[PDB]
Amino acid sequence: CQILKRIGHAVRVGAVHLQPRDALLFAVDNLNRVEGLLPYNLSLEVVMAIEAGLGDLPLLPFSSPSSPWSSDPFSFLQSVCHTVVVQGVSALLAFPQSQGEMMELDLVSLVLHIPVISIVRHEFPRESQNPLHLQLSLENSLSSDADVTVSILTMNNWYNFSLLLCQEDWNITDFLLLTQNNSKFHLGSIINITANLPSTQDLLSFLQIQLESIKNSTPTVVMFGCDMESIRRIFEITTQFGVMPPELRWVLGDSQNVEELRTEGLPLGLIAHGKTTQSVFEHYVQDAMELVARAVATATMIQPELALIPSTMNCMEVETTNLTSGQYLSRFLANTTFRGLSGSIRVKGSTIVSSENNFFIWNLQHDPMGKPMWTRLGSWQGGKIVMDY
Amino acid sequence: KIVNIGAVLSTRKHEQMFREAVNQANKRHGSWKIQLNATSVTHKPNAIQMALSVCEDLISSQVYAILVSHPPTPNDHFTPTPVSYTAGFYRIPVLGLTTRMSIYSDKSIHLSFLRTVPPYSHQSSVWFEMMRVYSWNHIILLVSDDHEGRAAQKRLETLLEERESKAEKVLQFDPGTKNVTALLMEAKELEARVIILSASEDDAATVYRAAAMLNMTGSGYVWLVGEREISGNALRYAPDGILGLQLINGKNESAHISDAVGVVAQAVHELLEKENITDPPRGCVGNTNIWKTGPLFKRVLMSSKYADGVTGRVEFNEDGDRKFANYSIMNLQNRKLVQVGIYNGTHVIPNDRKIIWPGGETEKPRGYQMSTRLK
Numbered sequence: 001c002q003i004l005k006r007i008g009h010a011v012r013v014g015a016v017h018l019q020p021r022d023a024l025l026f027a028v029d030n031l032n033r034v035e036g037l038l039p040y041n042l043s044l045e046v047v048m049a050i051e052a053g054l055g056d057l058p059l060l061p062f063s064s065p066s067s068p069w070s071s072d073p074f075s076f077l078q079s080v081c082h083t084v085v086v087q088g089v090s091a092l093l094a095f096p097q098s099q100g101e102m103m104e105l106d107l108v109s110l111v112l113h114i115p116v117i118s119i120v121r122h123e124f125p126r127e128s129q130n131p132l133h134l135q136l137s138l139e140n141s142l143s144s145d146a147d148v149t150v151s152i153l154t155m156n157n158w159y160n161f162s163l164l165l166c167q168e169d170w171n172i173t174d175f176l177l178l179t180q181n182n183s184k185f186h187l188g189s190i191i192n193i194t195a196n197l198p199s200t201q202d203l204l205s206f207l208q209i210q211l212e213s214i215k216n217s218t219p220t221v222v223m224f225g226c227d228m229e230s231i232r233r234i235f236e237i238t239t240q241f242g243v244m245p246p247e248l249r250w251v252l253g254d255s256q257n258v259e260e261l262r263t264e265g266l267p268l269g270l271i272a273h274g275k276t277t278q279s280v281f282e283h284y285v286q287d288a289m290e291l292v293a294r295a296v297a298t299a300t301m302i303q304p305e306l307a308l309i310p311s312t313m314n315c316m317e318v319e320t321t322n323l324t325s326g327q328y329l330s331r332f333l334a335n336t337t338f339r340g341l342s343g344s345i346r347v348k349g350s351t352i353v354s355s356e357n358n359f360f361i362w363n364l365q366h367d368p369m370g371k372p373m374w375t376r377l378g379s380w381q382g383g384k385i386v387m388d389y
Numbered sequence: 390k391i392v393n394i395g396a397v398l399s400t401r402k403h404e405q406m407f408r409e410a411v412n413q414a415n416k417r418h419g420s421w422k423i424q425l426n427a428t429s430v431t432h433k434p435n436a437i438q439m440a441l442s443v444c445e446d447l448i449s450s451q452v453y454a455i456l457v458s459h460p461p462t463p464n465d466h467f468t469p470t471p472v473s474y475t476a477g478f479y480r481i482p483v484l485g486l487t488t489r490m491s492i493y494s495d496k497s498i499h500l501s502f503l504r505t506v507p508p509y510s511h512q513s514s515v516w517f518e519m520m521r522v523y524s525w526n527h528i529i530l531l532v533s534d535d536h537e538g539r540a541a542q543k544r545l546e547t548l549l550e551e552r553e554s555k556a557e558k559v560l561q562f563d564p565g566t567k568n569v570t571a572l573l574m575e576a577k578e579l580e581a582r583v584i585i586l587s588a589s590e591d592d593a594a595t596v597y598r599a600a601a602m603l604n605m606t607g608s609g610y611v612w613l614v615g616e617r618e619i620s621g622n623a624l625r626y627a628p629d630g631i632l633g634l635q636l637i638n639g640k641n642e643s644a645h646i647s648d649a650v651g652v653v654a655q656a657v658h659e660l661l662e663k664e665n666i667t668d669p670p671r672g673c674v675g676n677t678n679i680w681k682t683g684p685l686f687k688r689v690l691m692s693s694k695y696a697d698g699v700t701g702r703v704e705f706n707e708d709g710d711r712k713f714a715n716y717s718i719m720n721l722q723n724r725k726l727v728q729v730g731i732y733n734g735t736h737v738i739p740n741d742r743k744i745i746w747p748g749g750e751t752e753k754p755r756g757y758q759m760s761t762r763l764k
Contacts, residue, residue, distance in 0.1 A: 099676060100675060100677050125679045
């Protein structure tokens with residue numbers, strides 16, 4: 001009662017951009033519209049800490065040339081701390097476009113004794129071991145996608161397998177590392193489809209020779225870094241000489257979009273893998289907001305007084321507290337893991353927010369009308385693949 | 390180009406010695422296009438305040454390599470921790486002169502780091518031969534609930550598994566224990582009277598106090614301990630003739646700094662001779678990406694071997710563990726430790742002075758107790 005009245009029975013989340021408002025608003029709406037996300041009838045709100053000064057929010061489009069940020073970070077840190085104290089933001093969401101901005105956000109979080117989660121397009125080498133600051137990468141590791149392909153090698157019992165590359169610069173290191181983990185499978189001949197061939201007759205002859213060589217060597221073939229047009233051309237060339245299933249097994253080792261995976265032109269029984277949905281920054285923001293709300297609710301379930309009121313009451317004076325509100329929330333965040341919109345978000349190394357995307361594996365098989373169609377074989381999460389049927 | 394060697398040291402004497410060594414390195418090295426710069430970072434007595442000071446001074450100056458100094462406190466892993474954390478994964482390896490902690494050797498955190506001295510567990514690799522040389526068919530171990538103790542126990546077990554020995558029993562003690570006499574009660578059941586334990590002075594003092602009243606320090610009983618508990622509050626009730634181990638040149642901070650500077654002088658010359666020789670990252674937050682010169686610089690640094698410095702025979706390799714270090718073995722005689730054995734890091738070369746077993750026994754003890762009450 002006292003904590004809810006003092007904090008307004010609402011949980012505020014800070015958003016600071018060095019240089020995502022719609023995504024933050026959508027995340028707040030999704031968190032608030034779902035019952036049970038937070039306890040004690042807590043409603044999620046978003047507070048933006050922009051470089052502009054204190055004032056009423058004007059609904060007027062202002063277009064002025066913003067000057068470059070000052071080299072002194074003390075003023076920015078003081079302004080961020082004052083905004084956090086005024087708004088009582090439990091967690092400050094950062095959008096750093098550079099490693100220096102991420103380091104500045106981490107320093108601000110350490111000074112303000114609050115947990116800050118920074119959204120980054122790609123992961124960067126982090127040397128700081130402070131558990132207060134966390135980084136969420138929009139783009140997951142490519143090897144995980146290969147982990148889907150290797151999942152076929154771990155489920156289809158195809159010990160003899162071959163790799164077909166439409167590009168010489170394909171990142172087949174992840175696929176090779178995943179395949180070499182298990183001794184049951186084996187690696188066959190490597191097929192390289194060079195794009196420098198002037199005559200299509202030579203390309204067709206090379207494809208036929210490769211198919212003849214791999215027919216008696218490996219019953220499964222995985223295409224790594226193969227475009228939709230290139231894969232369709234390869235399948236058509238194979239079918240021209242009669243090389244169709246179940247003589248060889250076709251697997252898409254690279255990411256394949258569901259929208260562009262047209263049923264026509266593909267061999268029967270071909271296997272493809274793809275992300276469940278296009279993980280936009282909005283989905284990552286929604287997942288981060290859901291995780292933050294869950295952590296805040298968990299902290300309030302044990303210590304509502306500490307969770308509601310942040311321990312950093314002074315922007316310049318620092319109190320020597322063994323366990324502060326920021327650390328209490330950071331522990332819950334490190335103990336938090338949930339299946340978000342962009343994928344299963346969890347905590348790795350107490351400092352990394354890893355979002356493992358569920359990879360759907362489908363097989364191009366007979367449809368109700370008899371024409372080829374994509375039938376979802378199953379889904380893989382965290383490297384564990386379970387068939388739909 | 391400008392080459393700066395940042396260093397975090399305590400007191401003005403260490404800073405002056407480091408500056409003098411850096412100045413002399415330029416004269417001792419034939420390089421003329423590379424200049425030597427000296428930077429001194431005082432040990433800030435605050436873990437939080439150390440990060441900003443390091444970033445605004447060490448990172449901003451774009452210096453090459455960072456030197457860590459032993460903390461002023463007798464036992465505190467705080468001074469080298471900020472050094473290894475501030476510039477750990479930024480392709481700027483940090484050199485610790487007295488980094489004897491066994492925990493910071495798995496490269497899980499602060500991968501770009503090296504140890505200039507062998508850890509306590511490293512001597513275990515030389516202890517097995519010391520156990521092999523002095524018979525010791527059956528021995529008993531006691532490892533406290535510590536990361537360094539666990540690593541030392543793992544190293545000793547790996548060494549003993551070569552001869553297919555299970556080391557009889559290893560008692561899992563705990564740090565901060567003040568009464569382990571009851572736990573030592575099961576130790577009396579073991580026929581072997583060899584006790585090998587590596588823990589801090591706090592854990593060892595209680596065991597030493599309890600053993601004397603238990604008459605476990607008498608003739609035929611051998612107690613083996615490490616350097617951490619060799620000196621300190623644990624020696625108040627240490628029985629005479631205790632087989633301890635010590636490391637030579639264990640407090641030569643100036644010598645270690647000079648050796649590091651000499652190694653860096655050749656490392657810089659070796660590195661400034663190949664393509665893609667990128668300068669160190671500039672600024673605390675100015676850098677926005679990992680340094681281009683990554684594993685190549687570390688591989689070049691961890692490949693030098695020459696007769697330089699007082700210690701000499703520098704062969705730092707593998708994960709960054711020092712090898713072939715001089716060991717001094719001193720036996721406590723009337724609460725006085727006199728160095729009676731010298732190990733060159735390969736084999737034991739003890740002096741002509743005799744060794745007396747604990748409890749007043751001059752003969753070599755036997756760790757076998759037959760004629761047991763068979764049932």
